[PDB]
């Protein structure tokens, strides 16, 4: 249900994930067309900032199913074991394509046996791609320093954008999902607040508002005030 209309911003990278929706609505057309496309698009950035968010949007905007996984539950996951989901994750996408596939913090494979096996296991399965093949794989990370050279390699993931905090807006809506829950009181400015934090991401607000709810609790009060939202975040 998540469009590029959901995603806040990311101006650049929804122009560069335009020729991946176009593709995944009518695959067939750039087959008959004997265009082929990246099929891999990492995403860089901090955490909290919509990776996993625009990615779902893409899916969204091509109305195609979105397939998730996270490369760190699969180096969570015992020898052997992860490599064989690794391989149930493509074989269920190959089942419903097109759509996107999207393996999160993917650092946990390209940055031990357990970490190795998944690893060359991806590399097999993104390798297997033949031109027909209608699956487009983005990954998230952020930490780009330990991210495995060969997944980098054309092919692969070769093809990245940066993401970054999110803008006004983005800020806003989070604040608004995450203050869903609290007592808020009549002063609590929320777009202010928005305007109020450049540069914040999705832990340092999800923490600001928690901190602001303690700041209440623990001086009894019965409602969050926009001076402990203010306070809080000093
Ligand atoms: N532009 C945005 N619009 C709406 N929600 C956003 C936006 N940016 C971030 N968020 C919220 O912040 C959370 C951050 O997680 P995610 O989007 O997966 O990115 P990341 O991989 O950087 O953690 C999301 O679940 C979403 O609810």
């Known amino acids: 249900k998540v469009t590029f209309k959901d995603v806040a911003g990311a101006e650049e990278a929804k122009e560069e994930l335009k020729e991946i929706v176009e593709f995944l609505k009518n695959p067939s057309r750039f087959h008959e067309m004997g265009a082929r496309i990246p099929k891999g698009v990492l995403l860089v950035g901090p955490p909290g900032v919509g990776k996993t968010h625009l ?3 893409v899916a969204g905007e091509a109305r195609v199913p979105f397939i998730t996984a ?3 539950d699969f ?3 015992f020898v052997g074991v992860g490599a064989a989901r690794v391989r149930d994750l493509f074989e269920t996408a190959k089942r419903h394509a097109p759509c996107i596939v999207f393996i999160d913090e993917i650092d946990a494979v390209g940055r031990n046996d357990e970490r190795e096996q998944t690893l060359n296991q991806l590399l097999v399965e993104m390798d297997g791609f033949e031109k027909d093949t209608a699956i487009v794989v983005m ?3 952020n930490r780009p320093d330990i991210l495995d050279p060969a997944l980098l390699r054309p092919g692969r993931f070769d093809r990245q954008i940066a993401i970054d ?4 807006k983005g800020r806003e809506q989070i604040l608004r999902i995450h203050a869903r829950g609290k007592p808020l009181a009549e002063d609590v400015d929320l777009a ?3 305007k109020r934090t450049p540069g914040f991401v999705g832990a340092d607000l999800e923490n600001l508002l928690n901190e602001a709810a303690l700041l ?4 009894g009060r019965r409602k969050i005030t926009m001076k402990d939202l203010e306070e809080a975040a000093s």
């Not at 209440?216 to 001086?219: D, L, Q, S, V, W």
């Open 139 to 141: 990954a998230a990370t």
């Open 165 to 168: 905090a999110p803008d006004v």
């Open 75 to 77: 180096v969570e996951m």
């Open 70 to 72: 996270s490369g760190s």
């Open 216 to 219: 209440a609790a623990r001086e």
């Open 55 to 57: 990615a779902r949007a």
């Open 192 to 194: 202010l607040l928005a």
